Amino acid sequence: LTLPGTAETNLAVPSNAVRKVQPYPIAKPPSYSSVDSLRPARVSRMDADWATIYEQVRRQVMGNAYVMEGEAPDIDVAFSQLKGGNLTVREFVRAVGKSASYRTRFMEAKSSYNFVLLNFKHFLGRAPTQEEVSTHIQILATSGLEAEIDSYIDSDEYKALFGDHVVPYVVYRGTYLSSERFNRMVKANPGGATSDKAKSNLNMIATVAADLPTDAIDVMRGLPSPITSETLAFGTAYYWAKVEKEASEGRSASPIGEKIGKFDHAPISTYTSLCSYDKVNKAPQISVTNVGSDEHSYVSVTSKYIAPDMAAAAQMLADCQKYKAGGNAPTGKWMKYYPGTTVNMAPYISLNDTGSDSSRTVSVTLDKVKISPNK
Amino acid sequence: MKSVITTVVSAADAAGRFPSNSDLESIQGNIQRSAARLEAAEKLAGNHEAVVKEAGDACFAKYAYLKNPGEAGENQEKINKCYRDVDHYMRLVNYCLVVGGTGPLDEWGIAGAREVYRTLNLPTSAYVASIAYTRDRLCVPRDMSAQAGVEFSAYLDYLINALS
Amino acid sequence: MKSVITTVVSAADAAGRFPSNSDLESIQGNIQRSAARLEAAEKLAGNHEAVVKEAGDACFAKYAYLKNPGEAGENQEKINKCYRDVDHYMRLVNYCLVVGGTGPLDEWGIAGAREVYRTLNLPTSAYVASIAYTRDRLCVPRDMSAQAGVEFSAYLDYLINALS
Amino acid sequence: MLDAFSRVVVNSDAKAAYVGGSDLQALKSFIADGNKRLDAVNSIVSNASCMVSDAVSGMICENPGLISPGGNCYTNRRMAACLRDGEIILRYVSYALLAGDASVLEDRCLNGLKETYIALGVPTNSSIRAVSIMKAQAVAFITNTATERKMSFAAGDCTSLASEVASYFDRVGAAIS
Amino acid sequence: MLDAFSRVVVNSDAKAAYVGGSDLQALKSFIADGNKRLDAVNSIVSNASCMVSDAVSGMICENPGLISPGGNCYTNRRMAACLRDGEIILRYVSYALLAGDASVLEDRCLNGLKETYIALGVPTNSSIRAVSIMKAQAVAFITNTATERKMSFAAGDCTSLASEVASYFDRVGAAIS
Amino acid sequence: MLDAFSRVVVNSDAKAAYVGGSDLQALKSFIADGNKRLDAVNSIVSNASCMVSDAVSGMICENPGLISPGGNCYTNRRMAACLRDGEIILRYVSYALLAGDASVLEDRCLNGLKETYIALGVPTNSSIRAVSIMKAQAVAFITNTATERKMSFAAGDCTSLASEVASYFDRVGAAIS
Amino acid sequence: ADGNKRLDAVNSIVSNASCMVSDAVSGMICENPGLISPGGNCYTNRRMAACLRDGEIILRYVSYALLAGDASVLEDRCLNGLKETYIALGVPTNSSIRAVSIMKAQAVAFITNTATERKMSFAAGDCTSLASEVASYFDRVGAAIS
Ligand SMILES: C=CC1=C(C)[C@@H](Cc2[nH]c(/C=C3N=C(/C=C4\NC(=O)[C@H](C)[C@H]4CC)C(C)=C\3CCC(=O)O)c(CCC(=O)O)c2C)NC1=O
Ligand SMILES: C=CC1=C(C)[C@@H](Cc2[nH]c(/C=C3N=C(/C=C4\NC(=O)[C@H](C)[C@H]4CC)C(C)=C\3CCC(=O)O)c(CCC(=O)O)c2C)NC1=O
Ligand SMILES: C=CC1=C(C)[C@@H](Cc2[nH]c(/C=C3N=C(/C=C4\NC(=O)[C@H](C)[C@H]4CC)C(C)=C\3CCC(=O)O)c(CCC(=O)O)c2C)NC1=O
Ligand SMILES: C=CC1=C(C)[C@@H](Cc2[nH]c(/C=C3N=C(/C=C4\NC(=O)[C@H](C)[C@H]4CC)C(C)=C\3CCC(=O)O)c(CCC(=O)O)c2C)NC1=O
Ligand SMILES: C=CC1=C(C)[C@@H](Cc2[nH]c(/C=C3N=C(/C=C4\NC(=O)[C@H](C)[C@H]4CC)C(C)=C\3CCC(=O)O)c(CCC(=O)O)c2C)NC1=O
Ligand SMILES: C=CC1=C(C)[C@@H](Cc2[nH]c(/C=C3N=C(/C=C4\NC(=O)[C@H](C)[C@H]4CC)C(C)=C\3CCC(=O)O)c(CCC(=O)O)c2C)NC1=O
Ligand SMILES: C=CC1=C(C)[C@@H](Cc2[nH]c(/C=C3N=C(/C=C4\NC(=O)[C@H](C)[C@H]4CC)C(C)=C\3CCC(=O)O)c(CCC(=O)O)c2C)NC1=O
Ligand SMILES: C=CC1=C(C)[C@@H](Cc2[nH]c(/C=C3N=C(/C=C4\NC(=O)[C@H](C)[C@H]4CC)C(C)=C\3CCC(=O)O)c(CCC(=O)O)c2C)NC1=O
Ligand SMILES: C=CC1=C(C)[C@@H](Cc2[nH]c(/C=C3N=C(/C=C4\NC(=O)[C@H](C)[C@H]4CC)C(C)=C\3CCC(=O)O)c(CCC(=O)O)c2C)NC1=O
Ligand SMILES: C=CC1=C(C)[C@@H](Cc2[nH]c(/C=C3N=C(/C=C4\NC(=O)[C@H](C)[C@H]4CC)C(C)=C\3CCC(=O)O)c(CCC(=O)O)c2C)NC1=O
Ligand SMILES: C=CC1=C(C)[C@@H](Cc2[nH]c(/C=C3N=C(/C=C4\NC(=O)[C@H](C)[C@H]4CC)C(C)=C\3CCC(=O)O)c(CCC(=O)O)c2C)NC1=O
Ligand SMILES: C=CC1=C(C)[C@@H](Cc2[nH]c(/C=C3N=C(/C=C4\NC(=O)[C@H](C)[C@H]4CC)C(C)=C\3CCC(=O)O)c(CCC(=O)O)c2C)NC1=O
Ligand SMILES: C=CC1=C(C)[C@@H](Cc2[nH]c(/C=C3N=C(/C=C4\NC(=O)[C@H](C)[C@H]4CC)C(C)=C\3CCC(=O)O)c(CCC(=O)O)c2C)NC1=O
Ligand SMILES: C=CC1=C(C)[C@@H](Cc2[nH]c(/C=C3N=C(/C=C4\NC(=O)[C@H](C)[C@H]4CC)C(C)=C\3CCC(=O)O)c(CCC(=O)O)c2C)NC1=O
């Protein structure tokens, strides 16, 4: 609406009101990038027709958002000024992000976390690092969707990679900063039939990017590599490592017992007397809820599996180090009066008086004695 | 879906803020309009296959050409499909009367309607004739109250505008 | 700014669609709540420098340390600046009582408040003490009606939450 | 953007004045005819497709130079363009009628519209006629004396709102002139 | 996402049944206590900062292992992280209380929260305690029996809504367990 | 991607062998029936809309569970989705028939299609039926014995190409099986 | 048929059930620092995490026993053969009794509202019938690992 030829709205830097719109599109990155010879060429504003420039925007920044004619008039109001030459494709893909039809399936339908991954995949073509999400949820939750979508378009990565006249697309850059941000990028962008709408959560890179360790699976990041970069490896060998993966990529199978939180459990033969392996470590989870009603209070019970927490156990080991280096006891020849572990041992007695006669109970048990530090 | 509450929560969520005072100011509008629209909903519901009977035939009265061979209505089963097709729209309008918005209309009957009826040669004029005949046959003494007919007709002419 | 009407028009505009039935359903909520909030607005307005007098001093009663040399209140003119600073918040709360939303509060007093008071060494605790003292001094017989005090206190504790 | 309630606070903010009971009855009156404005916006947006298709065809059938080759509404794509170019105008006037003042179409739709139609080669006086027909249809609808289709209403006056939607439609005329 | 009115249409859509007057009275009851739910949401969001700062400090002062080095709430950045990690939880439970059902926090906040805290090394049973304190504070507030600050209300019952916000707070417990 | 001429050079490149006159006559034969393949692709893409609308309606009218609520082709949006979900399949089989080998639909359309329909909840055996109807229509068209509409051709054999388009159609039968 | 006192008694356990296991295993080390020693059984997070899980299991198993008011479920899928799997895993049988008795002494302090760190808010009365019943349940589980 605003200018018949514009460069950059909202004047984030001061040096953009002097900055003219680029007359010719930005060239390739100057690294060599062996994959790029296999990948199809880029789509700029100058070379494309208005049919294919729209198709390629719907294929990249929308995933395959699967849009009808009646759906999304707001995308086409922004398209009505792109086709007139009012605004660049950079500000056009900014305007697509601010639209409601992008919101109703990516901000709306998804969660707090993989909306950020869906933004990186849709705009910069790649997957973020954990510290990049860390300074990004602060933009998203406390400053809103608008500044969050603004933070990609005014970023140096976007300006250097796509300029003002080339559609976003996945870029193979030769030298990458991390080695993990290569295959995170490849894992985030598969080929045809991508369908970001399908998986409500993807649950796989949302825990692989959630920590700097635990790089993802070999086969997921070598699946959407182009043909003859990866063929003669996909007849029978990794093929069943692929279909057994894509079965689990349906319904968003959770990686709680796989790749993160791995725990080698003890042999089943060591606890055959106790219980079967289908019911070991399940315990009743009781929630008792008070409200001054009697009509509306409730109690809930459910058996749940309790996994061991390696994070809480690591904290407990660091805390108990103070007892390790403070001695145990003095000793001498007089130890013969305390033959076993009966040093500082005593009988504990508990006496259970109650209203019923049959449920009365008497204790005795022999055990060690220690006084707490608060007494 | 697209209801009154699901705009004020999505706006507050996209802004990333708590439900503010104007946000609970808009749910009060439900308390004054639900008494008008819910009684429209079940006067529609308890009379529903009557207004497919006395209104799905009006398109055939207006467009008798489509009972010819080679047309959208060839045999009796396609006419049954037509009555089923318009009973679905009457069900979706009842769903939008109870929700408070036009949520159940868009993605269930409206989104995608332009391609199917173009690809399967179904004329939208015969759809909007049967809908419009149901619209103008509303009146205050017999059918419903004074305020029920208002947004009952407003949900109808929304569908009329969207199909055309 | 952030009012009730300016969410329902911006949502319909970002969707790129006409003002639908749920959109005019939410403006009806103004007709039932304006009668409560506008009378709160002018009981605030006709009594306004009284509740800076008997409430801007409560922070100095709670925090007498800031009248020391080297503090936020050194001389009398900084205390006049403090009374002006809290009269502005009382004006913005009156502006939000008449608008229907928290629009005039956000970009006029709240947005940017975190940096100024950090850079100019102004404690926010002395601000929220004076605001909270005006909040809890509300009651049904003397001050206003039963429904005026509700959202009059709700616009106050919103500012209390935002400053902290 | 700005509604009618928010119009008086930016006027009172210019003088650091509290909004008081001397100017509050003008808004209490605006609240009192809330249902009249509300049914009027509904009567506009109910029959909005014929509102657009009638106005563009009426603009065509008085000036049949646009249908000739070299006309701006000649081809099929440009007619599809023009049928939405005025539907957006109606869509923003419906916003301005509901909000109570002409601020939401002021900087969103009208800002930059002149040089757009100048740079594209859109005949401005034809678009003047096209929006004048829409103004006439609007005052026909919200006064309920459209001879072409009648809607049921509670009895009373609505001309105060009918002059409002007229004053919105000359702003679209002035910004393109 | 889904509100309480939209919960019954996706149930009736599964059987192609019209919503009729046999299940509408449960909706009209939900409309009848609209003001009770509305004041309750307001009473939650009024005192929400002490609601968070009290709950996290109460979770700290019972388990002072997090403050020790190697604790998850040890440093200043991680304490700033944890103070917002529960404020988001309260912010979404306030959405679910207003909407009338637990659909808006289940796929937006709770979907994927478990492996996030597993991959970062957040102790889940501590977050269980932190949200249980918030549940106790919630039923203290919306029953107006907070001994610490009292709010004025119209007289009546509110326990039907108090069990609702309790049932929202164990869903945040179950999804992290 | 890869065409039929480029299929033999990636086979000869694996052995560092020059393509010589021992395997050139198989491509000279492929060039000799260039017009047969060319008219066949034209006969496919000429009547392609009824090809899609007939096949999905035939898939519907044998399994009327998709039209029932809870069906995958129940609502209007999902039927609009399914009508294009097979039109893309026909659009890529038309590419593979022209290119001379099944490489252009293998990594572009078929790669990742299985878990898409699994994660979406698309019944695979129904899509099997929908594409076998399209296969039957294809061999009806390019042999010119469609009893429903006849096209004019020069006389001769076309079954060598008819088995080709059959072998393309069980490849996406196999890929989501 | 003690209704309200039983429900108040379980609430004083399952709410503050997160302190009680971590206090008990730190108290378990507090006597014996050779358990975290290299060669001990409470070495690295392979074993320390299973300890926290196991201390939590026998804690909860008692709250459902108290809610039901009898020790049936404490012997059904709880205890019939818990000793021999522990001697098959080679845990020390001495300090497990100490860990169980720290839970006893803490549960009887929580029920009678005699905690020095947290004063609970109850109705006026005296829960002497329930303070001994949880002691009987904890001895039932202490008699097993012996
Ligand atoms: C490049 C190749 C390519 C394709 C092959 C398609 C594949 C494809 N189909 C769908 C999506 C779909 N595909 C179908 C289709 C069917 N379901 C049925 O019951 C029938 C068996 C079948 C029609 C005959 C349906 C119904 C959906 C939508 C699912 C839903 O939301 O209900 C989606 C998700 C995107 C969206 O929903 O908009 C994708 C990627 N798209 C592509 O880009
Ligand atoms: C079965 C019976 C039985 C007992 C009675 C105790 C007896 C006992 N006391 C101590 C050991 C001790 N006991 C005391 C206690 C005291 N010294 C005093 O001057 C006061 C009389 C009293 C505190 C009021 C002290 C100070 C030590 C020695 C600690 C030290 O300096 O090494 C030890 C040495 C082992 C150790 O403590 O590490 C033993 C076995 N233990 C038992 O197993
Ligand atoms: C949830 C919402 C919903 C709808 C609105 C309908 C929409 C709809 N109608 C039809 C399908 C149809 N709809 C009609 C209807 C008509 N044709 C005419 O001659 C008249 C113009 C009109 C009736 C008055 C007919 C005749 C068919 C069958 C067409 C065919 O099978 O070729 C189909 C294809 C599947 C089918 O054959 O049933 C769909 C999706 N179905 C839905 O699920
Ligand atoms: C929920 C929607 C709904 C409807 C639109 C009607 C639809 C409808 N109207 C009529 C029947 C009628 N409808 C009218 C019309 C009117 N009657 C008056 O008193 C007014 C002047 C005017 C309001 C428009 C008249 C006069 C008849 C009787 C004669 C006739 O069949 O046309 C009939 C035939 C039998 C009957 O009366 O039921 C039906 C199915 N019924 C419904 O359940
Ligand atoms: C439109 C909204 C609006 C506001 C809310 C205020 C906010 C505000 N206050 C001050 C400025 C100030 N605000 C205070 C107020 C206080 N310091 C104290 O000791 C107490 C904590 C508190 C009064 C109770 C003081 C003392 C200054 C002057 C500080 C200085 O000049 O160093 C300034 C810097 C400009 C100036 O000096 O005036 C601004 C922007 N101004 C606005 O325009
Ligand atoms: C618009 C906001 C607004 C206010 C909060 C008050 C603020 C306020 N309250 C009081 C004055 C008072 N305020 C109260 C308090 C109350 N009186 C009752 O009958 C109730 C029990 C309780 C409601 C909270 C009492 C008892 C006095 C008189 C004694 C005193 O000065 O404290 C005074 C001193 C003189 C006066 O009464 O005006 C002022 C400035 N005035 C305002 O214009
Ligand atoms: C937000 C507000 C907003 C608007 C008001 C419109 C304004 C607008 N109209 C057109 C574009 C146009 N607008 C018209 C319209 C007309 N020409 C005539 O002869 C008639 C007088 C009139 C129809 C009644 C035509 C014909 C074009 C296309 C010009 C052409 O390419 O031939 C364009 C260029 C984009 C494109 O061509 O796709 C824009 C931005 N779009 C918006 O986003
Ligand atoms: C969901 C959608 C929906 C709406 C938008 C409103 C529309 C609505 N309008 C009126 C009520 C009215 N509406 C009008 C308006 C008009 N009468 C005319 O003759 C003119 C044609 C037109 C002016 C433009 C008048 C004059 C009244 C009666 C007086 C008034 O309330 O303003 C009332 C009742 C208020 C009352 O009369 O007490 C309602 C609820 N209702 C709904 O259900
Ligand atoms: C939309 C929903 C939504 C959420 C719920 C949160 C969830 C969430 N929390 C954290 C991140 C965190 N969350 C916590 C919180 C805690 N750790 C504890 O010890 C306590 C039990 C608890 C506070 C009470 C901490 C400490 C971190 C940072 C971990 C670290 O780097 O040390 C992160 C990683 C991003 C980052 O670190 O910046 C995410 C996504 N964010 C969201 O977007
Ligand atoms: C702008 C913000 C704003 C709101 C959200 C509402 C809040 C509000 N609450 C009630 C009215 C009420 N509100 C409550 C609720 C409660 N009473 C209690 O003792 C419990 C503590 C609490 C339950 C959680 C009750 C019991 C009534 C009276 C009955 C009812 O209307 O539901 C009414 C009047 C309706 C009537 O009573 O007829 C209003 C307008 N008003 C506003 O101005
Ligand atoms: C612009 C579009 C366009 C085309 C794609 C081609 C199609 C075309 N086909 C043939 C020619 C032919 N085409 C066929 C093919 C068939 N005959 C049948 O009976 C089968 C139905 C069908 C096989 C699938 C045969 C058999 C010949 C004659 C022999 C041959 O040239 O291959 C020829 C002449 C070559 C020749 O006969 O010498 C041309 C030019 N022409 C055009 O103008
Ligand atoms: C799940 C819902 C639910 C609960 C949480 C409890 C809560 C509860 N306890 C009692 C009532 C009581 N609760 C207790 C219990 C105790 N008193 C003490 O001093 C000890 C701290 C504690 C024993 C461990 C006693 C002694 C009474 C009074 C006698 C009785 O009613 O049992 C009452 C009746 C009214 C009241 O006195 O508050 C209620 C609602 N009951 C329930 O229905
Ligand atoms: C270094 C060695 C070391 C120990 C020997 C133990 C110390 C210890 N503390 C308690 C005792 C207790 N432990 C708790 C538990 C708690 N208190 C609360 O308020 C929280 C909710 C919760 C987690 C801290 C309670 C309530 C008591 C009883 C009151 C008390 O003695 O302090 C007991 C049982 C009774 C006793 O014999 O004293 C023991 C053995 N912890 C250690 O680290
Ligand atoms: C239904 C009742 C029920 C239980 C009680 C637990 C019982 C239990 N504990 C362990 C298994 C274990 N439990 C412990 C725990 C401890 N070892 C010690 O020396 C201390 C006493 C304590 C820590 C303080 C350890 C260290 C292991 C073995 C881990 C290993 O080394 O393999 C196992 C083997 C399975 C596994 O852990 O993978 C089982 C079934 N699980 C149940 O299902």
The residues near B82 (Cβ < 8 Å, ≥ 6 apart) are B56, B59, B72, B73
d(CA E6, CA E17) in angstroms, rounded, equals 14
From C12, B150, B31, select the one nearest D97 (Cα to Cα). Answer: C12
Query: How far is Cα B162 from Cα D5, in angstroms, rounded to an integer?
Result: 33
Q: Tell me which residue of C118, C86, C122, C111 sits closest to C162, measured CA to CA.
A: C111
Angle CA D97–D102–D106, to nearest 5: 130
Chain A, chain B: beta-carbon pairs less than 8 Å apart: 30
- The kind and range of the H/E element at A303 are strand A298-305
> What distances in angstroms separate CA B1 from CA A104, E9, G3, one per listed residue?
10, 10, 44
- Between CA E115 and CA A262 the distance in angstroms is 12
Task: Return d(Cα D42, Cα D24) in angstroms, integer.
Answer: 27
Q: How far does the centroid of ligand 11 lie from the alpha carbon of residue F150, in Å?
A: 15
Domain that holds residue B35: 1-164
Minimal Cα distance from B154: which residue of D? D46
| Angstrom distance (rounded) from CA E114 to CA E124 | 9
What is chain A's alpha carbon radius of gyration, rounded to the nearest angstrom?
Answer: 31
* Interface G:C, ≥3 CB–CB pairs < 8 Å: no
A352 has which bridge partners?
Answer: A361
Find the Cα–Cα–Cα–Cα dihedral E50, E56, E60, E65, rounded to 10°. Answer: -160
Q: If DSSP codes are grouped into helix, strand and coil, which group holds residue D55?
A: helix
- Of the residues F115, F127, F176, the best mutation for testing chain A's interface (the one with the most A CB atoms within 10 Å of its CB) is F115
Measured distance between the N- and C-terminal CA atoms of chain E, rounded to whole angstroms? 24
C-alpha span between A195 and E134 (Å, rounded): 38
| Dihedral of alpha carbons D106, D112, D113, D115, sign | positive
Q: Tell me, yes or no, if A71 comes closer than 8 A to chain B by beta carbon.
A: yes
Read out DSSP for C75-126? SHHHHHHHHHHHHHHHHHHHHHHHHSSSHHHIIIIITTHHHHHHHTT--HHH
Helices (H), chain F: 4-12, 25-32, 34-46, 49-62, 76-85, 87-99, 113-120, 124-141, 159-169, 171-174
Helix (H, G, I), strand (E, B) or coil at C14: helix
C-alpha span between A304 and E174 (Å, rounded)? 10
Query: Which string of DSSP letters, residue by residue, matches B42-77?
Result: HHHHTTTTHHHHHHHSHHHHH--GGGSTTSS--SHH
Ligand that comes closest to the CA of residue G66:
12
Nearest alpha-carbon partner for G9 in G102, G119, G108: G108
Q: What are phi and psi of A126, to 5 degrees?
A: -135, -170
Write down the residue that tokens 């039939």 correspond to. Answer: A193
The answer to whether residues B109 and B89 touch, using CB atoms and an 8 Å cutoff, is yes
- Position A357, amino acid: D
For this entry, resolution in Å reads 3.0
CB-CB under 8 Å, G128 with A275: no
Can you tell me the distance from the alpha carbon of D98 to that of E130, in angstroms, rounded to the nearest whole number? 46
Q: What is the per-residue DSSP string for D154-176?
A: -SS--HHHHHHHHHHHHHHHHTT
Q: How far apart (Å, rounded) are the C-alpha atoms in residues A264 and A252?
A: 24
d(CA A228, CA A37): 11
Comparing CA positions, the residue from E90, G52, E157, D154 lying closest to residue B18 is E90
Q: Name the token pair of A96.
A: 């697509």
Which helix (H) or strand (E) segment holds residue B29: the answer is helix B28-45
Give the pair of three-digit tokens for residue F176.
């989501």
Tally of CB atoms within 10 A around F8: 15
How many angstroms separate the CA atoms of D162 and F142, rounded?
65
Transcribe C18-83 into DSSP letters.
---TTTTTSSHHHHHHHHHHHHHHHHHHTTTTHHHHHHHSHHHHH--GGGSTTSS--SHHHHHHHH
The upper half-sphere exposure of residue A331, i.e. CA atoms within 13 Å in the direction of its Cβ, equals 8
Residue D131 CB neighbour total at 10 angstroms? 22
Domains identified in chain E, total number: 1
**CA atoms of C65 and E150, how far apart (whole Å):** 29
**Positive or negative: CA dihedral A302, A303, A307, A313:** positive
Identify the contact set of chain E against chain F, taking CB-CB distances under 8 A.
13-16
Asked if C13 lies within 8 A of D31 by C-beta distance, the reply is no
Q: In A259-297, at which residue ranges do the beta strands (DSSP E only) sit?
A: 282-289
CA of A372: how far to CAs of A319, A347, G23, G24, G31, in Å?
Answer: 16, 18, 11, 12, 10
Residues in chain E: 177
Distance, in Å, from the CA atom of F23 to the CA atom of F4, rounded to the nearest integer, reads 13
How deeply is G87 buried, as exposed, middle or buried, from its count of CB atoms within 10 A (0-12, 13-18, 19+)? exposed
The whole-angstrom separation of Cα E42 and Cα A227 is 59
| Residues G49, G50, G52, G55, Cα dihedral to 10° | 180
Please identify which residue in the block is written with the tokens 């009893």: F147
d(Cα D45, Cα C17) in Å, to the nearest integer? 10
Sign of CA dihedral A110, A115, A119, A125: negative
Q: What is the CATH number of the domain that holds F130?
A: 1.10.490.20
In Å, how far is D138's CA from the nearest CA of chain B?
17
* CA–CA distance, A97 with G67 (Å, rounded to integer): 54
Residue corresponding to tokens 């038309």:
F94
Q: With CB atoms and an 8 Å threshold, state whether A1 touches D88.
A: no
> A283 forms bridges with which residues in the sheet?
A304
Residue D62, number of CB atoms within 10 A of its CB: 10
Q: What is the DSSP letter of A287?
A: E
Does the distance separating the beta carbons of E65 and G18 come in below 8 Å? no
Query: With an 8 Å Cβ cutoff, is G115 touching chain A?
Result: no
Do A85 and A145 form a contact (C-beta atoms < 8 A)?
Answer: no
| G119 Cβ closer than 6 Å to some ligand 13 atom | no
Torsion sign (Cα): G135, G137, G139, G145: negative
Beta bridge pairs of residue A300:
A287
Of B31, B48, B94, Cβ closest to residue E34:
B31
In this structure, what token pair is assigned to residue B18?
A: 């708590």
State phi, psi for F112 to the nearest 5 degrees.
90, 5
Atom of ligand 4 nearest to the CA of B44: 1
Q: How many CB atoms lie within 10 A of CB F164?
A: 18
Which candidate, A115, F120, F117, places its Cα nearest to that of E111?
A115
Say if residues A203 and A113 touch (Cβ distance below 8 Å): no
Q: Is beta strand A282-289 parallel, antiparallel or unpaired with respect to A298-305?
A: antiparallel
The 8-class DSSP code of residue G89 comes to: H
Measured in Å, residue D153 CA sits from the centre of ligand 8 at 7
Chain A, nearest residue to G129 by Cα: A354
H or E segment and range at residue D130: helix D124-141
Using beta carbons and an 8 Å cutoff, which residues of C are at the interface with D? 1, 3, 5-6, 9, 12-13, 16-21, 23-24, 27-28, 30-31, 34-35, 38, 41-42, 44-46, 48, 91, 94-95, 98-100, 103-104
Given a contact cutoff of 8 angstroms between Cβ atoms, the answer to whether B45 and E20 are in contact is yes
The first and second tokens of residue A78, run together, are 């922004």
Tokens of residue C123, six digits = 């404690």
Instruction: For Cα atoms B95, B101, B107, give the angle at the middle one, nearest 5 degrees.
Output: 65
Structure tokens at C107: 């970009």
Q: Residue E118: list chain A partners with CB under 8 A.
A: 207, 256, 260-261
CA D101-D104-D109 angle, to 5 degrees, is 130
Dihedrals φ, ψ of B143, to 5°? -80, -60
* Ligand found nearest the CA of B136: 4
Residue D83 Cα distances to A83, D52, E123, angstroms: 17, 7, 60
Ligand 11 centroid, distance to F158 Cα (angstroms): 10
Both structure tokens of A2? 């605003």
Chain centre distance of CA D117:
18
Q: Is the CB of F176 under 6 A from ligand 11?
A: no
Cβ distance C24 to D42 less than 8 Å, yes or no, reads yes
Which range marks the domain in which residue D133 is found? 1-177
| Alpha helix positions (H), chain A | 50-60, 73-82, 89-98, 100-102, 114-123, 130-134, 137-142, 144-153, 156-162, 180-188, 205-208, 240-249, 310-319, 321-324
> Which residues, other chains included, contact C73 with Cβ-Cβ below 8 Å and sequence gap of 6+?
C60, C66, C67, C79, C82
G104, G135 contact by CB (below 8 A): yes
Q: What distance in Å separates the CA atoms of residue C81 and residue C73, rounded to the nearest whole number?
A: 9
Could you give phi then psi for residue A301, rounded to 5 degrees? -135, 145
Give the closest ligand to the alpha carbon of residue B36.
8
Q: Are B109 and B128 in contact (CB under 8 A)?
A: no
Q: For residue C162, give the nearest of C2, C40, C53 by alpha carbon.
A: C2
Residue G81 backbone phi and psi in degrees, to 5: 110, 35
Kindly report the CATH number assigned to the domain that includes residue B164: 1.10.490.20
Distance CA G90, CA G86 (A): 6
Contact F79, F66 (CB under 8 A): no
**E86 vs E88: CA distance, rounded Å:** 5
Residues 6 or more apart whose Cβ sits within 8 Å of residue D109: A1, D88, D89, D92, D172
Please check whether residue C102 is in contact with residue B22, taking contact to mean a CB–CB distance below 8 angstroms: yes
State which approach was used to obtain the coordinates.
Answer: cryo-EM
Quote the CA–CA distance of C71 and C84 in Å, as a whole number: 18
Substitution target from B2, B13, B24, B88 for chain E, most E beta carbons within 10 A: B24
- Token digits for A219? 């086969």
How many distinct helices (H) and strands (E) make up chain B? 9, 0
Q: What is the DSSP letter of D158?
A: -
CA E153 to chain CA centroid, nearest Å:
22
Q: Which ligand is in closest contact with the Cα of F109? A: 1
How far is G139 from G146, CA to CA, in rounded Å? Answer: 11
d(CA D42, CA C23): 10
Phi then psi dihedrals of residue D139, to 5 deg: -70, -25
| Token pair listed for F70 | 């809870």
- State the residue for tokens 């563009």: D56
User: Can you name the residues that pair with A361 across neighbouring β-strands?
Assistant: A352
- Nearest chain B Cα to D152, which residue? B150
**CB of C44 closer than 8 Å to CB of D51:** no
Contacts of B41 in chain E (CB under 8 A): 19-20, 24
Q: Residue E154: left if φ>0, alpha if ψ -120 to 50, beta else—which one?
A: beta
Give the pair of three-digit tokens for residue B112: 């995608």
Which of D42, D49, D152 lies at the smallest CB-CB distance from B161? D49
Touch criterion met for G and D (3+ Cβ pairs within 8 Å):
no
**What number of other Cβ atoms are within 10 A of residue A136's Cβ?**
17
What are the distances in angstroms from CA F22 to CA A174, C86, E14, F30?
Answer: 41, 96, 65, 15
Interfacial residues of C (vs E; Cβ cutoff 8 Å): 140, 146, 149-150, 153-154, 157-158, 160-161, 164
Residue A294 DSSP symbol: S
User: In 3-state terms, what secondary structure has residue G51?
Assistant: helix
| A123 in Cβ contact with A93 (< 8 Å) | yes
Beta carbons of D49 and D87 less than 8 angstroms apart = no
* CA-proximal residue: ligand 13, atom 16 (nearest): G19
Whether the Cβ atoms of residue A2 and residue D112 lie closer than 8 Å to each other: yes
Backbone angles phi, psi at F130, to 5 degrees: -65, -35
Q: In angstroms, what CA-CA distances link G35 with A158, A344, A346?
A: 56, 18, 21
D61 is in an annotated binding site: yes
The sign of the dihedral angle between the CA atoms of E83, E85, E88, E92 is: negative
CA-CA-CA-CA torsion sign (E57, E61, E62, E63): positive
Cα–Cα distance list, D132 to D64, D82, D126, G83, G126 (Å): 17, 15, 10, 93, 85
Three-state DSSP class for D115?
Answer: helix
Q: d(Cα A220, Cα A187) in Å, to the nearest integer? A: 6
Q: What is the CA radius of gyration of chain D?
A: 18
Interface contact flag, E6 B3, Cβ < 8 Å: yes
Q: What total number of domains does chain B contain? A: 1
Closest CA to E127 of E90, E163, E162, E173: E173
Chain A nearest-CA distance from F162, in A, is 27
Residue E73 counted as an annotated binding residue:
no
Q: What is the DSSP letter of A22?
A: P
Give dist(CA A238, CA A257) in Å, integer: 22
Q: Would you say C107 and C162 are in contact if contact means Cβ atoms under 8 Å apart?
A: no
